Coordinates of C-alpha atoms and ligand atoms in Angstrom, one line a residue:
Chain A
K296 CA 105.4 104.5 13.9
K297 CA 104.4 101.0 15.0
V298 CA 104.7 99.6 11.5
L299 CA 108.2 101.1 11.1
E300 CA 109.2 99.8 14.5
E301 CA 108.3 96.1 14.0
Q302 CA 110.7 96.0 11.0
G303 CA 113.4 97.2 13.4
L304 CA 114.5 100.2 11.4
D305 CA 114.4 103.8 12.6
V306 CA 112.6 106.7 11.1
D307 CA 112.3 110.1 12.8
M308 CA 108.9 111.0 14.4
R309 CA 108.9 114.4 12.7
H310 CA 108.5 112.9 9.2
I311 CA 105.6 110.8 10.5
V312 CA 104.0 113.8 12.1
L313 CA 104.3 115.8 8.9
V314 CA 102.7 112.9 6.9
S315 CA 99.8 112.6 9.4
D316 CA 99.3 116.4 9.3
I317 CA 99.2 116.5 5.5
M318 CA 96.7 113.6 5.5
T319 CA 94.2 115.3 7.8
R320 CA 94.6 118.9 6.5
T321 CA 91.0 119.1 5.1
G322 CA 89.2 118.0 8.2
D323 CA 88.9 114.3 7.1
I324 CA 91.4 111.5 6.5
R325 CA 92.1 112.1 2.8
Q326 CA 93.8 109.6 0.5
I327 CA 97.3 110.6 -0.5
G328 CA 96.8 109.5 -4.1
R329 CA 94.8 110.7 -7.1
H330 CA 91.6 111.0 -5.0
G331 CA 92.7 113.3 -2.3
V332 CA 95.6 115.7 -1.6
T333 CA 97.3 114.7 -4.8
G334 CA 93.9 115.1 -6.5
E335 CA 93.7 118.7 -5.5
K336 CA 97.1 120.4 -6.2
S337 CA 95.4 123.6 -7.6
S338 CA 97.3 122.8 -10.7
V339 CA 96.5 121.0 -14.0
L340 CA 99.9 120.0 -15.4
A341 CA 101.1 118.4 -12.2
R342 CA 97.8 116.5 -11.9
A343 CA 98.0 115.3 -15.5
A344 CA 101.6 114.3 -15.0
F345 CA 101.1 112.4 -11.7
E346 CA 98.9 109.8 -13.4
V347 CA 99.0 109.6 -17.2
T348 CA 95.5 110.7 -18.2
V349 CA 93.9 113.1 -20.7
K350 CA 90.6 113.5 -18.8
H351 CA 92.1 116.1 -16.5
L352 CA 93.4 118.3 -19.3
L353 CA 90.1 118.2 -21.1
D354 CA 88.2 118.9 -17.9
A355 CA 90.4 122.0 -17.3
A356 CA 89.9 123.1 -20.9
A357 CA 86.1 122.8 -20.6
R358 CA 86.0 124.6 -17.3
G359 CA 88.4 127.2 -18.6
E360 CA 90.7 126.7 -15.6
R361 CA 94.1 128.4 -15.7
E362 CA 97.3 127.1 -14.0
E363 CA 99.0 129.6 -11.7
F364 CA 102.4 127.7 -11.9
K365 CA 103.0 128.2 -8.2
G366 CA 104.1 124.7 -7.6
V367 CA 107.3 122.6 -8.3
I368 CA 106.3 119.8 -10.6
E369 CA 105.0 122.0 -13.5
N370 CA 107.9 124.5 -13.2
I371 CA 110.3 121.7 -14.0
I372 CA 108.1 120.6 -16.9
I373 CA 108.4 124.0 -18.7
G374 CA 111.9 124.9 -17.5
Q375 CA 111.6 127.8 -15.1
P376 CA 113.4 127.4 -11.7
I377 CA 111.6 126.1 -8.7
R378 CA 111.1 128.1 -5.5
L379 CA 112.6 125.5 -3.1
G380 CA 116.0 125.9 -1.5
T381 CA 118.2 128.1 -3.7
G382 CA 115.0 129.4 -5.3
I383 CA 113.7 131.0 -2.1
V384 CA 116.8 133.3 -1.8
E385 CA 117.0 136.3 -4.0
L386 CA 120.1 138.5 -4.1
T387 CA 120.7 142.3 -4.5
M388 CA 124.2 143.6 -5.4
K389 CA 125.7 147.0 -5.8
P390 CA 128.8 146.8 -8.1
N391 CA 129.8 150.4 -7.8
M392 CA 131.7 150.2 -4.5
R393 CA 133.5 146.9 -5.2
Chain B
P1079 CA 99.9 132.5 -36.7
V1080 CA 96.6 134.2 -35.6
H1081 CA 97.5 137.9 -35.2
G1082 CA 99.6 138.1 -38.4
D1083 CA 102.1 140.9 -38.2
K1084 CA 100.2 143.5 -36.0
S1085 CA 101.1 141.9 -32.7
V1086 CA 104.4 141.8 -30.8
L1087 CA 105.9 138.4 -30.0
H1088 CA 108.3 137.7 -27.1
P1089 CA 110.9 134.9 -27.0
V1090 CA 110.6 132.4 -24.1
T1091 CA 113.1 129.6 -23.4
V1092 CA 111.4 126.4 -22.6
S1093 CA 111.9 122.6 -23.0
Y1094 CA 110.9 121.4 -26.5
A1095 CA 108.9 118.7 -24.9
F1096 CA 106.6 121.4 -23.4
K1097 CA 106.2 122.9 -26.9
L1098 CA 105.4 119.5 -28.3
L1099 CA 102.8 119.0 -25.5
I1100 CA 101.3 122.4 -26.3
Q1101 CA 101.0 121.6 -30.0
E1102 CA 99.5 118.1 -29.3
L1103 CA 96.9 119.7 -27.0
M1104 CA 96.3 122.2 -29.9
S1105 CA 95.8 119.3 -32.2
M1106 CA 92.9 118.5 -29.9
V1107 CA 90.3 121.1 -29.3
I1108 CA 92.1 122.2 -26.1
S1109 CA 93.4 125.7 -26.5
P1110 CA 96.4 126.5 -24.2
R1111 CA 97.1 130.2 -24.1
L1112 CA 100.6 130.8 -22.6
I1113 CA 100.6 133.8 -20.3
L1114 CA 103.9 135.7 -20.4
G1115 CA 105.4 137.6 -17.5
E1116 CA 108.4 139.8 -16.7
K1117 CA 111.7 137.8 -16.4
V1118 CA 112.9 140.3 -13.8
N1119 CA 111.3 140.3 -10.4
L1120 CA 110.2 143.9 -11.2
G1121 CA 108.7 145.0 -7.8
Chain C
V5 CA 109.3 162.7 -20.7
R6 CA 110.2 160.8 -17.6
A7 CA 110.7 157.0 -18.1
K8 CA 111.8 154.5 -15.5
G9 CA 113.1 151.1 -16.8
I10 CA 115.4 148.3 -15.9
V11 CA 118.9 148.4 -17.2
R12 CA 121.1 145.3 -17.5
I13 CA 124.7 146.2 -16.4
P14 CA 126.9 143.3 -17.6
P15 CA 129.6 141.8 -15.3
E16 CA 132.5 143.2 -17.2
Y17 CA 131.3 146.7 -16.4
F18 CA 131.7 146.2 -12.7
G19 CA 133.6 148.7 -10.4
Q20 CA 132.9 151.7 -12.6
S21 CA 130.3 154.3 -11.6
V22 CA 126.8 153.1 -12.0
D23 CA 125.4 156.2 -13.7
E24 CA 127.8 156.3 -16.6
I25 CA 127.4 152.6 -17.3
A26 CA 123.6 152.9 -17.1
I27 CA 123.5 155.9 -19.5
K28 CA 125.9 154.0 -21.9
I29 CA 123.7 151.0 -21.9
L30 CA 120.6 153.1 -22.5
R31 CA 122.3 155.1 -25.3
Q32 CA 123.4 151.9 -26.9
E33 CA 119.9 150.4 -26.8
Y34 CA 117.9 153.6 -27.3
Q35 CA 120.2 155.7 -29.6
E36 CA 117.7 155.7 -32.4
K37 CA 114.1 154.6 -33.3
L38 CA 113.2 154.6 -29.6
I39 CA 110.3 152.0 -29.3
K40 CA 107.1 151.5 -31.3
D41 CA 104.9 153.8 -29.1
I42 CA 105.5 157.2 -27.6
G43 CA 107.6 158.5 -30.5
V44 CA 110.5 157.2 -32.5
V45 CA 112.9 159.9 -31.4
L46 CA 116.7 159.4 -31.1
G47 CA 117.2 161.9 -28.3
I48 CA 118.4 161.0 -24.8
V49 CA 119.9 163.3 -22.1
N50 CA 120.9 161.5 -18.9
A51 CA 119.9 159.0 -16.2
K52 CA 120.3 158.1 -12.6
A53 CA 120.2 154.5 -11.4
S54 CA 119.8 153.1 -8.0
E55 CA 122.9 151.4 -6.4
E56 CA 121.2 148.2 -5.4
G57 CA 120.5 145.8 -8.3
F58 CA 118.8 142.4 -8.6
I59 CA 120.5 139.2 -9.7
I60 CA 118.4 136.6 -11.5
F61 CA 118.8 132.9 -12.0
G62 CA 121.1 132.1 -14.9
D63 CA 122.4 135.7 -15.3
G64 CA 125.5 137.2 -13.7
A65 CA 124.7 140.7 -14.8
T66 CA 123.0 143.2 -12.4
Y67 CA 119.6 144.7 -13.1
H68 CA 119.1 148.3 -11.9
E69 CA 116.0 150.5 -11.9
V70 CA 116.9 153.8 -13.7
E71 CA 114.9 156.9 -14.5
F72 CA 116.0 158.8 -17.6
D73 CA 115.3 161.7 -20.0
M74 CA 114.0 161.0 -23.5
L75 CA 113.3 163.6 -26.2
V76 CA 109.9 162.4 -27.5
Chain D
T2 CA 104.7 136.2 18.9
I3 CA 103.2 133.2 17.1
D4 CA 105.0 130.8 19.5
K5 CA 108.2 130.8 21.6
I6 CA 109.9 128.4 19.1
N7 CA 109.0 130.8 16.3
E8 CA 110.7 133.7 18.1
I9 CA 113.7 131.5 18.8
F10 CA 113.9 130.6 15.1
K11 CA 113.5 134.2 13.9
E12 CA 116.2 135.6 16.3
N13 CA 118.5 132.7 15.4
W14 CA 118.4 133.2 11.7
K15 CA 118.9 137.0 11.8
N16 CA 122.7 136.9 12.3
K17 CA 123.3 133.7 10.4
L18 CA 123.4 132.6 6.8
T19 CA 121.7 129.5 5.5
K20 CA 123.4 127.1 3.2
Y21 CA 121.0 127.8 0.4
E22 CA 121.8 131.5 0.5
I23 CA 125.5 130.6 0.6
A24 CA 125.1 128.4 -2.4
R25 CA 123.2 131.1 -4.3
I26 CA 125.8 133.7 -3.5
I27 CA 128.7 131.4 -4.6
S28 CA 126.9 130.5 -7.8
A29 CA 126.1 134.1 -8.7
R30 CA 129.6 135.3 -7.9
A31 CA 131.1 132.4 -10.0
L32 CA 128.8 133.3 -12.9
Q33 CA 129.9 136.9 -12.6
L34 CA 133.6 136.1 -12.5
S35 CA 133.2 133.8 -15.5
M36 CA 131.7 136.5 -17.7
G37 CA 134.6 138.8 -16.9
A38 CA 133.9 140.5 -13.5
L39 CA 137.1 141.5 -11.8
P40 CA 137.8 139.6 -8.5
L41 CA 138.1 141.6 -5.3
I42 CA 140.6 139.3 -3.5
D43 CA 144.2 139.1 -4.6
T44 CA 144.4 136.9 -7.7
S45 CA 147.9 135.7 -6.9
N46 CA 148.9 133.4 -4.1
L47 CA 145.8 131.2 -4.6
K48 CA 146.3 127.5 -5.0
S49 CA 143.2 127.1 -7.1
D50 CA 142.5 128.8 -10.5
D51 CA 138.9 127.6 -10.5
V52 CA 136.2 130.4 -10.5
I53 CA 134.1 128.5 -7.9
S54 CA 137.1 128.4 -5.5
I55 CA 137.7 132.1 -6.0
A56 CA 134.1 132.9 -5.3
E57 CA 134.1 130.7 -2.2
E58 CA 137.2 132.5 -0.9
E59 CA 135.6 135.9 -1.6
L60 CA 132.5 134.8 0.4
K61 CA 134.7 133.6 3.2
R62 CA 136.6 136.9 3.3
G63 CA 133.4 138.9 2.8
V64 CA 134.8 141.4 0.2
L65 CA 132.0 140.9 -2.4
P66 CA 129.1 143.4 -1.9
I67 CA 125.9 141.3 -1.8
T68 CA 122.8 142.0 0.3
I69 CA 120.2 139.3 0.7
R70 CA 116.6 140.5 1.1
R71 CA 114.4 137.8 2.8
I72 CA 110.7 138.4 2.6
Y73 CA 108.8 137.1 5.6
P74 CA 105.4 135.6 4.9
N75 CA 103.7 138.5 6.8
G76 CA 105.3 141.1 4.5
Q77 CA 108.4 142.0 6.6
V78 CA 111.6 142.2 4.6
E79 CA 115.1 141.7 6.2
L80 CA 118.3 142.9 4.6
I81 CA 121.5 140.9 5.5
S82 CA 124.8 142.2 4.4
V83 CA 127.9 140.1 3.5
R84 CA 130.5 142.9 3.7
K85 CA 131.4 142.2 7.3
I86 CA 133.6 145.3 7.5
Chain E
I9 CA 78.7 109.9 25.8
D10 CA 81.8 112.1 26.3
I11 CA 84.9 111.4 24.1
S12 CA 87.1 114.3 25.2
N13 CA 88.6 112.1 27.9
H14 CA 90.0 109.6 25.4
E15 CA 93.8 109.3 25.3
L16 CA 93.9 109.9 21.5
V17 CA 92.0 113.2 21.8
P18 CA 94.2 116.2 22.4
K19 CA 93.1 119.3 24.3
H20 CA 90.6 121.4 22.2
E21 CA 89.9 125.0 23.1
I22 CA 88.0 127.8 21.4
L23 CA 90.0 131.0 21.4
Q24 CA 88.5 134.5 21.4
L25 CA 88.2 136.7 18.3
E26 CA 91.0 139.1 19.4
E27 CA 93.4 136.2 19.7
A28 CA 92.4 134.9 16.3
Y29 CA 92.9 138.3 14.8
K30 CA 96.4 138.6 16.3
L31 CA 97.2 135.1 15.1
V32 CA 96.1 135.7 11.5
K33 CA 97.9 139.1 11.4
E34 CA 101.2 137.5 12.7
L35 CA 101.0 134.5 10.4
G36 CA 100.1 136.8 7.5
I37 CA 97.4 134.4 6.1
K38 CA 93.8 134.4 5.4
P39 CA 91.9 132.3 8.0
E40 CA 90.9 129.6 5.5
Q41 CA 94.5 128.9 4.7
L42 CA 94.9 127.2 8.1
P43 CA 94.2 123.5 8.3
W44 CA 90.4 123.3 8.9
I45 CA 88.2 121.0 11.1
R46 CA 84.6 120.3 10.3
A47 CA 82.0 121.8 12.6
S48 CA 80.3 118.4 12.9
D49 CA 83.4 116.6 14.3
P50 CA 82.5 115.3 17.8
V51 CA 85.5 117.1 19.4
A52 CA 84.4 120.4 18.0
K53 CA 80.7 119.7 18.9
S54 CA 81.7 118.9 22.5
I55 CA 83.2 122.4 23.0
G56 CA 80.4 123.9 21.0
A57 CA 82.6 125.2 18.2
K58 CA 80.9 127.4 15.5
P59 CA 81.9 127.9 11.9
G60 CA 84.3 130.7 11.3
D61 CA 86.1 130.2 14.6
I62 CA 89.7 129.1 15.2
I63 CA 90.3 126.1 17.5
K64 CA 93.5 126.0 19.6
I65 CA 94.6 122.3 20.0
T66 CA 97.4 121.3 22.4
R67 CA 98.9 117.9 21.5
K68 CA 101.3 115.9 23.6
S69 CA 104.5 115.6 21.6
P70 CA 107.9 114.2 22.7
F71 CA 109.9 117.1 21.3
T72 CA 108.4 120.1 23.1
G73 CA 106.0 118.4 25.5
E74 CA 102.9 120.4 24.5
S75 CA 102.4 121.6 20.9
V76 CA 99.9 124.3 20.0
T77 CA 98.2 124.0 16.6
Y78 CA 95.3 126.0 15.1
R79 CA 92.4 124.7 13.1
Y80 CA 89.7 126.5 11.2
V81 CA 86.0 125.6 11.7
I82 CA 84.2 125.1 8.4
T83 CA 80.6 124.3 7.5
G84 CA 79.9 120.5 7.2
Chain F
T39 CA 73.1 121.8 1.9
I40 CA 73.1 125.3 0.4
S41 CA 72.9 126.8 3.9
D42 CA 76.4 125.5 4.8
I43 CA 77.9 126.9 1.6
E44 CA 76.2 130.3 2.2
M45 CA 77.4 130.3 5.8
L46 CA 80.9 129.6 4.6
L47 CA 80.6 132.5 2.2
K48 CA 79.3 134.9 4.8
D49 CA 82.0 133.9 7.3
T50 CA 84.8 134.3 4.8
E51 CA 83.4 137.7 3.8
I52 CA 83.2 138.8 7.5
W53 CA 86.8 137.6 8.0
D54 CA 88.1 139.5 4.9
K55 CA 86.2 142.6 6.1
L56 CA 87.9 142.2 9.5
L57 CA 91.3 141.9 7.9
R58 CA 90.8 145.2 6.2
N59 CA 90.0 146.8 9.6
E60 CA 86.5 148.0 8.6
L61 CA 85.2 147.5 12.1
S62 CA 86.5 146.4 15.5
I63 CA 86.5 142.9 17.0
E64 CA 83.4 143.0 19.1
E65 CA 81.0 143.9 16.2
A66 CA 82.5 141.1 14.1
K67 CA 81.9 138.7 17.0
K68 CA 78.3 139.8 17.1
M69 CA 78.0 139.3 13.4
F70 CA 79.5 135.7 13.7
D71 CA 77.1 134.8 16.5
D72 CA 74.1 136.3 14.7
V73 CA 74.8 134.4 11.4
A74 CA 75.5 131.2 13.3
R75 CA 72.2 131.5 15.3
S76 CA 70.2 132.5 12.2
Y77 CA 71.4 129.7 9.9
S78 CA 71.6 127.0 12.5
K79 CA 68.0 127.6 13.4
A80 CA 67.1 126.5 9.8
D81 CA 69.1 123.3 10.2
Chain G
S2 CA 114.6 143.0 -18.9
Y3 CA 113.4 146.1 -20.7
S4 CA 110.1 147.4 -19.1
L5 CA 109.4 151.0 -20.2
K6 CA 106.9 153.1 -18.3
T7 CA 106.4 156.8 -19.0
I8 CA 105.4 158.9 -16.1
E9 CA 104.6 162.7 -16.0
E10 CA 105.6 163.0 -19.7
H11 CA 106.4 166.4 -21.0
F12 CA 106.2 167.8 -24.5
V13 CA 109.3 168.1 -26.7
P14 CA 110.4 171.7 -26.9
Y15 CA 111.0 172.6 -30.5
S16 CA 112.9 175.8 -29.6
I17 CA 115.0 174.0 -27.0
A18 CA 115.4 170.9 -29.2
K19 CA 118.5 172.5 -30.7
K20 CA 119.9 173.1 -27.2
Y21 CA 119.2 169.5 -26.2
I22 CA 120.9 168.1 -29.3
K23 CA 123.8 170.4 -28.8
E24 CA 124.1 169.2 -25.2
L25 CA 123.9 165.6 -26.4
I26 CA 126.7 166.2 -29.0
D27 CA 128.7 167.8 -26.2
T28 CA 128.3 164.6 -24.1
Ligands
LIG1201 ZN1 98.5 136.5 -31.7

C-alpha cells in the first residue's frame, strides 16, 4: 500500500489483501514465482508453460504424476472450457412446455 | 497404433498444438496417456 | 432389459412432447445392430425421459436421461 | 452461519441473477434459436432480426423455460427459475 | 519476551473442537484445505497452539472493522 | 523430522474419521491431546 | 452423449418375441 501510495496512484486495498493472503497461505512468506505458489500448482502443463522448461515434464514422467486438469491455464491449452465466470453456471432446460 | 483393431477409439476435439506437444513428448521417452471422460455432466 | 442413457434432443424438435422425440431419437440411433456388447438385436419398445435436460457448452440441444426397453 | 457477511451474501443471491448466468442463458438461447428452435416471443414487431437480440428480449420477458442449478461448495444445490409467471 | 502486544500482530485465539467441526461442516472442506500456520510460529506458540487445531484470528480491517479468519496448525 | 510427518498423518486421519462421524467430539479431543502429548515428549 | 448402462436386465422371451415385434410394427 505504501509503495502504491508514494507514486500517487490509487489501488483498492482488497486486491492488496488478496495478494498478501495468497503469499502467506502455506504458513511462510512464499515467493510468487517458480519457487513458491507458482511452483506448486498441483498441475504439470501449467508449470511447464509458466517458464519454458522440459525438466518439469520429465520429472512428472519419472514420478508417474498425473494432471487432474482442474485449473485454468491447462484447460485453455487443450481447448476445454474453463470453470471461471460463465463456466461456473450450468443450465437445465425443459423444452416440452415452451 | 498399439491396440490394433480390438480396442474402441473415441474422437476428442483439441487444439492441434496440444497434439503436436503430445507427439513431441512421445518422441522423448515421456509417455502421456490421455484420459477420456464423458462430455456430458452425467451426474 | 432396462437401459438408462442420455438422449440428445436437437433444438428443432422443441415444443413437441419429450417422450415421442426421445423414442424417435433412440429408434434412429438404435434401430439395428444395437451396440457391440449385450446383444446385436434390433428390437426396441418404448421410453420415458425426464423433463429437465442439461445444456452443455457449444451445444444448443438438450440432453435428457431416459430409460427404455430393448429386446436383447 | 460461517459469518454474518456470508449469510448476507447467500440471502442476497437467492432472488437475483448474476451477469455470468445471464450471459450463459443468452448464449444458450441464441445457439438454440440459430439451429432452428422456435422463438417463444412474437417474431413480428421486433426492430432487430438478430438472434442475440431475440434471446435477450426473451430473457427480459421471461418466457424461455430455463432453470439454473447452482451447487454450493457444501453440497447444497439451489434451483432458480426464469419463468417469472 | 511477549510479541502478542505488537501492533502488527492480530488477535489469535484457539477455538474448541465443536466450533472447528461446525466450521468445517459449513465450509464443506477438509481441515487441511484451510490456510495453515506452522505450530512453531511465535504467535501460535504464545497461545500454546497444538497441531491439528484451528486458530481463529481477528484482524483489524477498514471494511468491516474486525475480520475473522481461520488457520490450520501443521507440524513444523 | 519423521515425528512431525507422522503426527500430521495421525491428525489428518483423526480429522477424516471425525468427518465421517465415527465418534463424538470429546473422544476426538482426547485423541488429539494424547497424540500431541505423546509425540511432543519425544521432541 | 451416449452412455449405455443396463440395469436389472431380463431375458428375451422367444414366445413373446413375436408379440413384441408385432407391437413394434404397430408403432
Ligand atoms: Zn490402444
